[PDB]
Symmetry: C3
Amino acid sequence: MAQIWLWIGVIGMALGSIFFGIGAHNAKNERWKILFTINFFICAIATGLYLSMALGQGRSVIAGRPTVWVRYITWFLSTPLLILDLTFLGKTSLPITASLLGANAYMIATGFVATISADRTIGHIWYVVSCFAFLATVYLLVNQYRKQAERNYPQAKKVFRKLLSVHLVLWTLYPIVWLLGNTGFNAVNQGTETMFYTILDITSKVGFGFLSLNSMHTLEKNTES
Amino acid sequence: MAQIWLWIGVIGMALGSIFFGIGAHNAKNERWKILFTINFFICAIATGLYLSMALGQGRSVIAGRPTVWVRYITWFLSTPLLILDLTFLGKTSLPITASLLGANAYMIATGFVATISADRTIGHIWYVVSCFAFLATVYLLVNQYRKQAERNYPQAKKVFRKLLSVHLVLWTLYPIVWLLGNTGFNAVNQGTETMFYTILDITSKVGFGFLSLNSMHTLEKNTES
Amino acid sequence: MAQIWLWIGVIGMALGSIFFGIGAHNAKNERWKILFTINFFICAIATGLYLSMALGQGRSVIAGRPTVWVRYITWFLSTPLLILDLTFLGKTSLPITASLLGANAYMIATGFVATISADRTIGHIWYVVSCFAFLATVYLLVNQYRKQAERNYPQAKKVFRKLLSVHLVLWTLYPIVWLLGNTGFNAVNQGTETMFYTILDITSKVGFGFLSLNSMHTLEKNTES
Ligand SMILES: CCCCCCCC/C=C/CCCCCCCC(=O)O
Ligand SMILES: CCCCCCCC/C=C/CCCCCCCC(=O)O
Ligand SMILES: CCCCCCCC/C=C/CCCCCCCC(=O)O
Ligand SMILES: [Cl-]
Ligand SMILES: [Cl-]
Ligand SMILES: [Cl-]
């Protein structure tokens, strides 16, 4: 079950990479070129993640607990680009963009520590820290990010409402999966945990990528001269 | 002794993070927002460092020598922000900012190698290299950085004199502690070495952070219309 | 044989660092200062690489195969600067610069995985992936990069022809050496592989550095008022 879902991730991320790469190659306009390029690299990074996992790499047995550490390495590179999708579309200011990238980096890094710690009490402390770094981004996203975006696109508040809702709901599922997997309560087996992360990853990367493109189209139409 | 000082670092860095974060949240002005945000992340990074150390992580016994490697990982992230404090305040040019960030990165990286090398003769070679990377920053700071800053703020040369004096004196103490600890002569025990680094870290992060804010206030007053 | 070539690299990279550093110190003009600074750090990074290797560091015996992993760590830092040499000189746009830096980062990262994988079939898969990341840069370099550069310097198309030819020919030799060494067919001994990488590194760093400076001189003369 685990193995098939890892190859599904390889396929899904590769297809995402191809179609965003084609879009980047054909883009009319530097802003479109940038947006396609961000999403291409999100999916290209993840294709490499899923290939490494599918080939059996990136995994260690830590004190008897099988632990996939490689996803934190690539997440640390792809999740800032997903943030960049948001801050590019919302024309976010530099301090708020940096704060979002910093808080997100903090989240992934402490999530990594929460995962690889042999002492699972210590790991669960870092999980809480990581959750508070995530909540920091939530605060930034629904306050400063949203207000700037709505100020920049007064006629497109719904566009950013949908971007934020999809981002927040989907990303909140990750710490839930983490608590369900062998990092926490071990309420689901490894094959189910792998399926969950794979579906989340494809949705949060390929799915959000296409939403960001659709969002861009609406923003440009709303701001046609 | 070591354990208490690690928790003192957690507390001190957390308090620094809180007060810089409050300042960032209330800031009047993008330049103030940026400066508070830089210092928030300096202290937030260090809070995580000190929590990891306080919980017993980030340490290895290398050929019988207890070695705290995690501080080099976080220093590599926080020390460039301390440089950014300086180059933001001094409106430093791009090549000099990059040179400062590069030389500082070189210093921390070779300091890491100087620390983890089992062969302590090799480690001491890297210590010398790291010292010369530090001296490179000294040269850049008291020459190009200072002249640009004084050119940008002709009425505030004292402000940059104090920033540089505090930076240079405090940062020079780090290679001294390193020579005193079990990385060099082992003239002080681990508990004293830990206290020294903790006091240095709190002063160079929380202390320098507040100095940078005071400096900003003086710079803006000197350049009030 | 291996040991002498590692020290030759230390010497050659150190000399490159010194002369680019002198050029940076004397530069007339921010653009010249930037270009000298990029090449200084390329060579300074590599000096540290070659010192670590010369001192016997950065090498592991992986399942019986001596494997120099440290070169991928420093290549990951120096090769983007060589790209920056190109994109600085060609005034490349942001999406194409990012795409070049991203594809190059992908190449080095999968090259690292191709090298350290104990399962050499898996390693050879990553070698192919890394080759396709390199071919991605080739496509970007001879298409978008070149057209932008020729548009920016219509009277200096030969300058970018020489830059690209030297970059492409020299960098293509690296995957050939990799196939010849114990990472692939093991057709040359370690001492010869080390000599090959050392000569390639000195040429692609010190040599390309001086070519980039000569290129800059021609570009500025062609665009003298
Ligand atoms: C791989 C992605 C890593 C993301 C790291 C994010 C770091 C966040 C830290 C923010 C502090 C800096 C805030 C902005 C500084 C601007 C500097 C300047 O204007 O001179
Ligand atoms: C985590 C912090 C890491 C800091 C790394 C610093 C790297 C220093 C290297 C400098 C070389 C580049 C100099 C400026 C390049 C400008 C490029 C351009 O203008 O196109
Ligand atoms: C150490 C060097 C590492 C190089 C990493 C290169 C990353 C390449 C990824 C590209 C995606 C981003 C494309 C440009 C984003 C611009 C963002 C913006 O304008 O807000
Ligand atoms: Cl990923
Ligand atoms: Cl730190
Ligand atoms: Cl290198």
